[PDB]
Design an enzyme around this catalytic site. Structure first.
Site, short mmCIF file in Angstrom:
data_model
loop_
_atom_site.label_atom_id
_atom_site.label_comp_id
_atom_site.label_asym_id
_atom_site.label_seq_id
_atom_site.Cartn_x
_atom_site.Cartn_y
_atom_site.Cartn_z
N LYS A 4 -3.69 7.57 3.20
CA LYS A 4 -3.09 6.38 2.56
C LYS A 4 -4.03 5.42 1.87
O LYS A 4 -3.84 4.25 1.99
CB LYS A 4 -2.27 5.59 3.56
CG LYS A 4 -1.40 6.44 4.49
CD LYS A 4 0.12 6.02 4.51
CE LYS A 4 0.46 4.72 5.33
NZ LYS A 4 1.93 4.38 5.30
N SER B 286 -6.43 0.93 2.76
CA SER B 286 -5.43 -0.04 2.45
C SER B 286 -5.52 -1.17 3.44
O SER B 286 -5.44 -2.32 3.03
CB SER B 286 -4.05 0.56 2.54
OG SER B 286 -3.80 1.40 1.45
#
Ligand SMILES: [Fe+3]
Ligand SMILES: [Fe+3]
Ligand code: NA
EC number: 3.4.21.-
Length: 690
Positions: free
Chosen positions: A72, A258
């Site tokens: 991610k 992230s």
């Protein structure tokens, strides 16, 4: 938190440059940066995901892969190409051939090809996509690679499995265990390596970026031995790439975590290195330059700098709808792809909207399924990402959607300003627009428009038309102040900061949580919610529309709160100073607000139009399957999905864009207010339009 950035590498030559960069930063007392040694892109992506590295430049194709389930990651800074006069954050994927043969893009079967790498942008994702009709691929378990091997007689596609697909590594020139490898070891790897494949005459076509022939050939005479295959089965020179390319795609970008990604430190190091070792900044080290035999070491050669990627943008929004779902399509059948192509995915703001939408999907005969998000903006992001398709937006949200590339399709057509009875030609009837008004109680007689400021207010939600754009818009013309949180003392304006004065009067859902969130879970959200805020003596004035008052009084709304209220207990504030009754709105209203409009992408316009028109014939206002089964414009004065007072979805009559629909000066109004503050989504799309 930050005092050394860790930069992942994929190669010994690449590590050496990393170490050079390390000691030149020390030479100038600037930002530190450590170096990690891995052997491949996927290894660096894993590295960053477990805090063992920080950052790595990656090609479009590997941005997608880097953003999925386990890892991610997201792009924090994109590469810049072209000239200083004209910088860009995007490049073109082309197909360069030699001068002589007379074949075209559709005559590649049986020929030999020269790709950059597997899962690369220009090298695989685009060429294979453009050529899919020709491949006669049947779809899944069988890898797409297999179909490519039957198509081209031989080719070099670094990264491919030599054992399962030997045809894809025939023309690679590596030695032993380095043949068909995803590294500099394999001579025909990356942009410059694949043009060398063309050069030597191993392949007949070479799928690369546009600037590669200019980077490797010195004199303009050597370049006139090459042309470009065009989507329109035409050949043209290598400098007419603007008018001849397979695709237009995002540039490579430095990715990172992230959650705790040290975004700040990455940008700080990149800008400093951009300033002290950029385009001809110091001969003792070159950030965008590599030794002779090597190429594109840590970043792309002949790059001109970086450009920070805004916080809201993720892997997908970065790649854009066109390229993002194209990558997704390679892992799908032709039957699955055209099936999604012909179904409409509506977005729902909130669980209540979501619930009504599932009911509709069960009776749609598989022409509608649903998606969802907690706020309106998040749902717009989904349409850009291709996960959703359409949604009814208020004029205010049509601007934001508008600048993100979406366009209007059909607009809500409310009962006309006394013209006809249940109109047969409602669909072709032009929209008249609704009336934005202010509302107050009767008892408070001293309240007028010239003294409304200072009191408590009840808004629909931020960036909506009658709720925000117009009331704050008139007050801004007067004061000029950009601080909207001092206009009224206390107020309920869902979408605003909860610890702000603008959310003080909100009450959240039935449990006491979700205060000031901009979906229907907030009791005081929307038109019905803003009026509710008034009736319960939470605020003093309430900015909704005329028919909202009507629909919630004289027993037209049987809920607890609105049961006993009556229309005569409420009045409207006029701009001149006077106050009239609610029925006199035509002559006592702040401004005309344009109708709500269902928006989508430019690629989903025609199917969305024939579907909505069909579904409304069934569950519409005068729909055949109405009361008995389901009704689209009916949810019991909560306005779930569409507005309850909607007659029919109508054509726009040539206003096909956000500019032409809202109106020239409405767009002027919004922009001015946006100067004081833009949303993160507004900042996001602005980046992507450049
Ligand atoms: Fe690339
Ligand atoms: Fe509205
Ligand atoms: Na690069």
């Amino acid at each position: 938190r930050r005092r050394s950035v860790q930069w992942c590498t994929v190669s010994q030559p690449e590590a050496t440059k990393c170490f050079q960069w390390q000691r030149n930063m020390r030479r100038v007392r600037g930002p530190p940066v450590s170096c990690i040694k891995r052997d491949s892109p996927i290894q660096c992506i894993q590295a960053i995901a477990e805090n063992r590295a920080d950052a790595v430049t990656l090609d479009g194709g590997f941005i997608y892969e880097a953003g999925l389930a386990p890892y991610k990651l997201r792009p924090v800074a994109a590469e810049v190409y072209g000239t200083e006069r004209q910088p860009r954050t995007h490049y073109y994927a082309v197909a360069v051939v030699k001068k002589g043969g007379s074949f075209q893009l559709n005559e590649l079967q049986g020929l030999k090809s020269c790709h950059t790498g597997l899962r690369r942008t220009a090298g695989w994702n685009v060429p294979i996509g453009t050529l899919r009709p020709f491949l006669n691929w049947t779809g899944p378990p069988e890898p797409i690679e297999a179909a490519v091997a039957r198509f081209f007689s031989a080719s070099c596609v670094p990264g491919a499995d030599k054992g399962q697909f030997p045809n894809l590594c025939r023309l690679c020139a590596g030695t032993g265990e380095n043949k068909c490898a995803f590294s500099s070891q394999e001579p025909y790897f990356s942009y410059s390596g694949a043009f060398k494949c063309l050069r030597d005459g191993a392949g007949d076509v070479a799928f690369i970026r546009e600037s590669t022939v200019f980077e490797d050939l010195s004199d303009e005479a050597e370049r006139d031995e090459y042309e470009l295959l065009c989507p329109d089965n035409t050949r043209k020179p290598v400098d007419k790439f603007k008018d001849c390319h397979l695709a237009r795609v995002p540039s490579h970008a430095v990715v990172a975590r992230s959650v705790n990604g040290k975004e700040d430190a990455i940008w700080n190091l990149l800008r400093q290195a951009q300033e002290k070792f950029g385009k001809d900044k110091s001969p003792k080290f070159q950030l965008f330059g590599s030794p002779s035999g090597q190429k594109d070491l840590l970043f792309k050669d002949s790059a001109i700098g970086f450009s920070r990627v805004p916080p809201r943008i993720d892997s997908g929004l970065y790649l854009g709808s066109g390229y993002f779902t194209a990558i997704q399509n390679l892992r799908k059948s032709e039957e699955e792809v055209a099936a999604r192509r012909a179904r409409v995915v509506w977005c729902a703001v909130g669980e209540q909207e979501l619930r009504k939408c599932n009911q509709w999907s069960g009776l749609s005969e598989g022409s509608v399924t649903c998606s969802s998000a907690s706020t309106t903006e998040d749902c717009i992001a989904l349409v850009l990402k291709g996960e959703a398709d359409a949604m009814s937006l208020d004029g205010g949200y049509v601007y934001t959607a508008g600048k993100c590339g979406l366009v209007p399709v059909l607009a809500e057509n409310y009962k006309s300003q006394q013209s006809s009875d249940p109109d047969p030609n409602c669909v072709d009837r032009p929209v008249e627009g609704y009336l934005a008004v202010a509302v107050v109680r009767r008892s408070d007689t001293s309240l007028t428009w010239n003294s409304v400021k200072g009191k408590k207010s009840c808004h629909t939600a931020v960036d909506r038309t009658a709720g925000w754009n117009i009331p704050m818009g008139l007050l801004f013309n007067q004061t000029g102040s950009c601080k909207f949180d001092e206009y009224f003392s206390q107020s309920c304006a869902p979408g605003s900061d909860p610890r702000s004065n603008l959310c003080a009067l909100c009450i959240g859902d039935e449990q006491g949580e979700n205060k000031c969130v901009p979906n229907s879970n907030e009791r005081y959200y929307g038109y019905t919610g803003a009026f509710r805020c008034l009736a319960e003596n939470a605020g003093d004035v309430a900015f909704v529309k005329d028919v909202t008052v009507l629909q919630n009084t004289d027993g037209n709304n049987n809920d607890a709160w609105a049961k006993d209220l009556k229309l005569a207990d409420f009045a409207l504030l006029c701009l001149d100073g006077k106050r009239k009754p609610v029925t006199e709105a035509r002559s006592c209203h702040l401004a005309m607000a344009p109708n709500h409009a269902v928006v989508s992408r430019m690629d989903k316009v025609e199917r969305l139009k024939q579907v909505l028109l069909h579904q409304q014939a069934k569950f519409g206002r005068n729909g055949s399957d109405c009361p008995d089964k389901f009704c689209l414009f009916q949810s019991e004065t909560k306005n779930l999905l569409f507005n309850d007072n909607t007659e029919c979805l109508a054509r726009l009559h040539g206003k096909t864009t956000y500019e032409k629909y809202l109106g020239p000066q409405y767009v002027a109004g919004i922009t001015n207010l946006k100067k004081c503050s833009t949303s993160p989504l507004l900042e996001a799309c602005e980046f992507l339009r450049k």
